[PDB]
Amino acid sequence: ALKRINRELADLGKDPPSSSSAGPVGDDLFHWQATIMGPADSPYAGGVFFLSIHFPTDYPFKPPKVNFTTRIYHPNINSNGSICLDILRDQWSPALTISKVLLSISSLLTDPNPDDPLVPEIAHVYKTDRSRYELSAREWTRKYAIG
Amino acid sequence: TIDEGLYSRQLYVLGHEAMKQMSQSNVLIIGCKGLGVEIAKNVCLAGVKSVTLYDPQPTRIEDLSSQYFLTEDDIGVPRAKVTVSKLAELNQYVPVSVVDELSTEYLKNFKCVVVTETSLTKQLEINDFTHKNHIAYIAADSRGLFGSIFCDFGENFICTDTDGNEPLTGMIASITDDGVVTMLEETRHGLENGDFVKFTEVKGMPGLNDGTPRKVEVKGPYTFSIGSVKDLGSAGYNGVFTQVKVPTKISFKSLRESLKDPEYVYPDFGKMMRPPQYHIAFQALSAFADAHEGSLPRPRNDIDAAEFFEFCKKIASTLQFDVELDEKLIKEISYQARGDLVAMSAFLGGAVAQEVLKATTSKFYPLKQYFYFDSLESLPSSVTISEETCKPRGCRYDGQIAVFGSEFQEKIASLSTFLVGAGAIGCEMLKNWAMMGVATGESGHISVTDMDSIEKSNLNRQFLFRPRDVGKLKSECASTAVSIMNPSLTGKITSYQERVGPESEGIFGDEFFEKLSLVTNALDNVEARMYVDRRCVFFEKPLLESGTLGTKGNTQVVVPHLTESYGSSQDPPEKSFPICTLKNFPNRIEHTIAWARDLFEGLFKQPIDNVNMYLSSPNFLETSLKTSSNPREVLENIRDYLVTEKPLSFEECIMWARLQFDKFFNNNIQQLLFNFPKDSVTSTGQPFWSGPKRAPTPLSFDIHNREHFDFIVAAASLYAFNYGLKSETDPAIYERVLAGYNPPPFAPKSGIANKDKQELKSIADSLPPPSSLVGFRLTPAEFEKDDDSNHHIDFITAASNLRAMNYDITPADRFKTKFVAGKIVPAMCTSTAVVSGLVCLELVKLVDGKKKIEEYKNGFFNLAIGLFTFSDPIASPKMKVNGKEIDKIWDRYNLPDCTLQELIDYFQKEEGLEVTMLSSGVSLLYANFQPPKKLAERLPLKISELVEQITKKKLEPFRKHLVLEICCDDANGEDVEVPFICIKL
Numbered sequence A: 001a002l003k004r005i006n007r008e009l010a011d012l013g014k015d016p017p018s019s020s021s022a023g024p025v026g027d028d029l030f031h032w033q034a035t036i037m038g039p040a041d042s043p044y045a046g047g048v049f050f051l052s053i054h055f056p057t058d059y060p061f062k063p064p065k066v067n068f069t070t071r072i073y074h075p076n077i078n079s080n081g082s083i084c085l086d087i088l089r090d091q092w093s094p095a096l097t098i099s100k101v102l103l104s105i106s107s108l109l110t111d112p113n114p115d116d117p118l119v120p121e122i123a124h125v126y127k128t129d130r131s132r133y134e135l136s137a138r139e140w141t142r143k144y145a146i147g
Numbered sequence B: 001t002i003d004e005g006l007y008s009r010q011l012y013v014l015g016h017e018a019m020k021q022m023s024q025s026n027v028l029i030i031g032c033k034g035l036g037v038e039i040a041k042n043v044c045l046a047g048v049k050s051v052t053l054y055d056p057q058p059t060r061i062e063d064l065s066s067q068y069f070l071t072e073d074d075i076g077v078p079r080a081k082v083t084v085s086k087l088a089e090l091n092q093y094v095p096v097s098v099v100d101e102l103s104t105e106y107l108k109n110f111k112c113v114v115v116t117e118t119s120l121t122k123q124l125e126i127n128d129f130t131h132k133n134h135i136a137y138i139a140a141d142s143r144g145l146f147g148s149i150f151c152d153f154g155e156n157f158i159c160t161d162t163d164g165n166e167p168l169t170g171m172i173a174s175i176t177d178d179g180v181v182t183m184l185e186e187t188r189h190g191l192e193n194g195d196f197v198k199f200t201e202v203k204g205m206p207g208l209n210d211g212t213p214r215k216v217e218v219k220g221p222y223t224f225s226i227g228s229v230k231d232l233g234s235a236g237y238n239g240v241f242t243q244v245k246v247p248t249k250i251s252f253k254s255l256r257e258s259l260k261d262p263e264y265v266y267p268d269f270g271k272m273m274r275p276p277q278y279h280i281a282f283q284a285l286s287a288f289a290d291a292h293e294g295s296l297p298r299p300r301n302d303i304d305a306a307e308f309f310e311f312c313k314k315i316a317s318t319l320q321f322d323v324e325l326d327e328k329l330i331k332e333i334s335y336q337a338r339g340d341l342v343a344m345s346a347f348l349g350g351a352v353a354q355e356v357l358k359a360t361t362s363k364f365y366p367l368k369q370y371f372y373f374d375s376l377e378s379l380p381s382s383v384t385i386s387e388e389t390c391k392p393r394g395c396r397y398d399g400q401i402a403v404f405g406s407e408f409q410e411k412i413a414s415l416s417t418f419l420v421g422a423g424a425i426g427c428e429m430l431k432n433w434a435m436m437g438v439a440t441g442e443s444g445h446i447s448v449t450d451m452d453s454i455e456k457s458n459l460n461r462q463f464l465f466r467p468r469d470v471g472k473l474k475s476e477c478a479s480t481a482v483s484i485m486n487p488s489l490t491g492k493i494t495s496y497q498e499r500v501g502p503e504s505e506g507i508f509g510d511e512f513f514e515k516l517s518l519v520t521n522a523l524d525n526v527e528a529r530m531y532v533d534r535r536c537v538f539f540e541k542p543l544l545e546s547g548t549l550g551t552k553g554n555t556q557v558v559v560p561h562l563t564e565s566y567g568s569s570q571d572p573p574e575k576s577f578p579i580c581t582l583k584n585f586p587n588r589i590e591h592t593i594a595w596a597r598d599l600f601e602g603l604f605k606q607p608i609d610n611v612n613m614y615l616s617s618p619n620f621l622e623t624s625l626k627t628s629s630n631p632r633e634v635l636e637n638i639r640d641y642l643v644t645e646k647p648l649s650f651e652e653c654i655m656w657a658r659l660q661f662d663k664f665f666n667n668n669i670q671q672l673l674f675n676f677p678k679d680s681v682t683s684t685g686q687p688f689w690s691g692p693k694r695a696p697t698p699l700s701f702d703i704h705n706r707e708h709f710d711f712i713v714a715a716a717s718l719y720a721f722n723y724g725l726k727s728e729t730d731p732a733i734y735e736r737v738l739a740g741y742n743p744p745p746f747a748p749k750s751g752i753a754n755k756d757k758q759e760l761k762s763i764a765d766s767l768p769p770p771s772s773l774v775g776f777r778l779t780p781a782e783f784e785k786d787d788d789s790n791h792h793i794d795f796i797t798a799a800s801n802l803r804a805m806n807y808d809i810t811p812a813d814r815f816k817t818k819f820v821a822g823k824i825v826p827a828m829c830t831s832t833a834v835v836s837g838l839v840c841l842e843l844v845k846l847v848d849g850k851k852k853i854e855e856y857k858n859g860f861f862n863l864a865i866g867l868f869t870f871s872d873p874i875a876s877p878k879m880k881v882n883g884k885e886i887d888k889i890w891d892r893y894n895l896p897d898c899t900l901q902e903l904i905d906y907f908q909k910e911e912g913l914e915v916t917m918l919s920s921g922v923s924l925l926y927a928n929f930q931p932p933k934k935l936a937e938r939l940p941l942k943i944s945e946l947v948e949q950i951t952k953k954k955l956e957p958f959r960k961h962l963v964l965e966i967c968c969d970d971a972n973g974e975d976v977e978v979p980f981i982c983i984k985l
């Protein structure tokens, strides 16, 4: 529990993610507030997105609860911030680190997956009218992810 | 007419058909000693038609060594007569009778015949008649630490289910013309060669959809073969395969034929040469008893052992057994011939009861045929076992003194145990402890803790509780029952009603845990197990863990400084479905049930919590606006449940239920089909609605349909309960109100500054002030599965079935919905008895203080296939710290309440290690990367003061120690694990 959490924290500290920065809330090790930088080759460029990570008491035997806080216009992210990632619901194994999760989320932001979406309307817009999706994503990442 | 309010947990293991066939079968039990009474109790709890007893011998004192329905006032009375009265109160649907004399023809009145404590000639006589008349015959024998079971269900037994598992089903990606069936990506069917499967919904190959089972040839973890499908088609796409389970024919042999050439069942593969020895030994025991007027060899007597060995030689020569007899093992059997242990009796009783259930229900794979078991590793070695010490003293513990001796009896009588929980396993453990005489001495004591209350469904497997005890605490009732069983335990048992957790450390503190001898868990959740394991590791007390699941069971023993703890082992956790699967594209009924549960929580629980919290917290809105993930949702819920849609009668509740039906089963589907039409294609050109994704279809509300009406009734009743209105169930009012409902129009929408805060403020100020509404509270609906008059499972079933009808999924009844939604763990009485027996066999090992690790045995068993296995515990890992051998689990650092700087200096000078992280509880006390100001502010403080400051809570007076987790780096910076720190306040 605490030992694994601090090992991951030290690995993050010693190895700079350079696109993410995860730190505990106050002095609680079971609650982190991570940060993600918008990918360069994506509509979310130049944006800072905040994530809340709640480690379950049975960590690492149960997946952490990762939820977006900054509103983002993505097909696989709903209004509650829930993220559609296989490694967080049922494919979780006690061998995945937080840096891996952040890399997975960054890759998801790089290219969405509309074939198995979580927000049907955004997926439909992405599939049919790409330009409107690009404009909406830029507007949202300018309104929320900046400032 | 199965009483589902009593057999709720058992029906998830057996089923409705099995119990229907079981409630028409009679069982006769010959012999009413401890093993016989255990079998009778398990069978009565199981629910057979009736039980008959036959044991006319007068009661003796030593018989009380394993009989819990006999008292010292019953000496001289036949056992059956004094046992039937107490057996009749276990179950009200199972009459229990007594027969004075047994005649051969009378055996035709019964479906199963169990024989215990009978000579071999009489067993042969009974079997010669119960074999040719097709009657199940089960013979059990318990001699000291040895046990034998023999089963004979006729020459044409039919086994419908051979493993008890659910049929394997899966999805298909593609089917070739050569019969090669391929699963989807990363999908393993789990079939075996020889299985039969059937295909449905196969596109391109309609012939495979007929339903005729076909053979399976396993070619890999992801593909298999069925043969040749040339005629039916060329290539098939998509579909679902389902395994078909076919009946099997099992042929047994009579006892007379099987004595010469038996067929053993091996309970352990480390000792495979023993069962042939036991086969001769038990026959020689019967012959010796016949040669001494039914007198078994005296305990630890050399002359009787020699005579028994001569009989063994004679029998081995007679039967032409080409096996060399092991003198030591045979003489050990001779020494313990008069033993009567309650643990072995419970183990064999559970096994034999399961065999009886198999015989009556024609289910599960039975023993075929002999089963010889021994737990000789439990024999004490730290006490003097001889003829003088093992002689009877004319007390009720003679059956145990004859195996362990008087000194070990005194050792047991001074135990100070701690039992966590009072469930089925707890009740069995308490019974075993009462029979064994645990804590009947001057220094003994027993503690039992459990906060739950007795319910109706708990009486099926918890024999210490009676229907008159429904609604009371478990611990008090269990303590009273076991004090009645053994009068010597009056005042030696303390029953608490406290939940064992972080909040109970004020009672179960250092003083309480420093006087115990061992801790036994009877829990059903992993969190409490882990907490108790951590406490035992800290205090260094032996721990006994036991778990059951349906017919499977396991027992584990944790020994200080010898074996690893419970938390070092991991079990497969539950599988939680992806959110995208539950929300939009379900393909199984479990997805719909989970969606229905989430809908129930979101409709009847969370909004009520928000409304109640709004009227209590004076600053709720401001906190929610900057804390809650969706302030808009909370504001909308509060408005809707306070002013917009507050009902004034039940008719408005019915209208709201109809509106919610329309919202969740007719409109969202239209929106989804507008976003993803049925003819839409993916990026690769394949159709979108194919495979795991099923095309939905909106539902039109038809009042005459049963499911729609059920959903309306359940939703209206729950809404009325939330608003404290008077609900009604007459269909007339529902049909009258729902006729006059005008559906609002709905058309799917295609879409196409900082005023959001202004809109949220406008919503917020619309709410009435909290001062205006004083004393107005809404009742949240707390989910309770066991109550059938609150419409919870009814609503969940209705919603799940409606969503299944949306996606053309097979609907499920209320039984399976209650099983899935309620997280009900299947349980059985036989499995509980077996695990209790195994744990009590490990307890005598723990009491004797055995040091080697090969003398302990973690046990696993599966009663569906008659599988038993025992393995050595995993040794606690060692490590090298500062060039010294450190135990990873059972070692710690003992330090005073020194300052943080002094602790760092101590670790730097003694261990030569640099501290990098120090935590306690859920707080990070010290880290190497914190700003220097914070450390300089925290360094000169003591550990207790530092914890008080960080956790913002004073240390309680009862607290006397702190557990600190420290991660430190060596001189070169390489991370090295170190044991935790035990700071002494």
Ligand SMILES: Nc1ncnc2c1ncn2[C@@H]1O[C@H](COP(=O)(O)OP(=O)(O)OP(=O)(O)O)[C@@H](O)[C@H]1O
Pocket (backbone or CB within 6 Å): B009, B420, B421, B422, B423, B424, B425, B449, B450, B451, B452, B457, B458, B474, B498, B499, B500, B501, B522, B523, B524, B525, B528, B825, B827
């Ligand atoms: N943390 C705990 N501290 C103390 N007792 C506990 C704790 N957790 C569970 N128990 C008790 O352990 C016992 C477990 O027994 P069991 O699971 O068979 O009963 P149940 O949960 O009441 O029944 P069912 O599972 O059939 O609905 C229950 O008495 C439960 O109250």
Ligand SMILES: [Mg+2]
Pocket (backbone or CB within 6 Å): B452, B453, B455
């Ligand atoms: Mg209960």
Ligand SMILES: [Mg+2]
Pocket (backbone or CB within 6 Å): B524, B825
């Ligand atoms: Mg339970």
